[PDB]
Design a protein around this ligand. Structure first.
Ligand SMILES: NC(=O)C1=CN([C@@H]2O[C@H](COP(=O)(O)OP(=O)(O)OC[C@H]3O[C@@H](n4cnc5c(N)ncnc54)[C@H](OP(=O)(O)O)[C@@H]3O)[C@@H](O)[C@H]2O)C=CC1
Ligand SMILES: COc1cc(-c2ccccc2)cc([C@@H](C)C#Cc2c(C)nc(N)nc2N)c1
Length: 157
């Protein structure tokens, strides 16, 4: 499978100043569970905002930089390279890679953050007209997770 994995707010903001605008441990657990033992593909900027690969899965970074080399990270230089990666691949960000991949993926795991944040990077517009709701699950509010959020699994019609 080729999937998008993204968290976005009510206006499709995904980021501000190289960071996620919200702190939601439930969503990080969701990412962990979904992607462990599989492959994450991400743009160079997204990777550098974290600075370390995520343990226990393949970390793939797309960059034009022929010098790019980080321990625990595989590098690709073209979109076409994504289609050669085996197994379940998750397009993990950011704006640029989402824009390049949204028309190509089989499905999308979206966390909708029911808030309006200041952002400088956005998930591209999409219509439910193109996507079937395979599942929609409300995240639990609590002390450490205080923004309402919904886990959506969307599959291209
Ligand atoms: N809320 C969420 O779920 C998520 C949020 N984010 C956020 O996204 C933001 C970063 O987004 P954005 O600025 O778009 O950056 P990206 O992560 O998409 O990285 C852009 C870079 O990726 C490389 N790249 C993209 N396409 C190609 C290509 N076709 N060929 C070769 N290289 C390519 C280029 O690297 P180079 O310049 O080295 O050549 C480019 O400059 C951050 O704020 C982060 O917080 C990211 C993922 C999820
Ligand atoms: C190694 O590169 C990254 C690692 C993480 C990460 C690090 C620790 C725990 C969970 C995720 C997050 C990211 C950012 C850019 C992301 C994301 C993302 C999140 C946080 N939630 C959902 N639902 N989808 C995403 N793509 C990059």
């Amino acid at each position: 499978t080729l999937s998008i994995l993204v968290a976005h707010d009510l206006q499709r903001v995904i980021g501000f100043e190289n960071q996620l605008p919200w702190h939601l441990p439930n969503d990080l657990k969701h990412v962990k569970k979904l992607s462990t033992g599989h492959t994450l593909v991400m743009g160079r900027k997204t990777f550098e905002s974290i600075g370390k690969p995520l343990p226990n899965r393949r970390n793939v970074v797309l960059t034009s930089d022929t010098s790019f080399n980080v321990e625990g990270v595989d590098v690709i230089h073209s979109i076409e390279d994504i289609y050669q990666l085996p197994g379940h691949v998750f397009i993990f960000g950011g704006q640029t890679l989402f824009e390049e991949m949204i028309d190509k993926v089989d499905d999308m795991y979206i966390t909708v953050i029911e808030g309006k944040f200041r952002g400088d990077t956005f998930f591209p517009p999409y219509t439910f007209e193109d996507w079937e709701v395979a599942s929609s699950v409300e995240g639990k509010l609590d002390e450490k997770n205080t923004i309402p959020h919904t886990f959506l699994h969307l599959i291209r019609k």
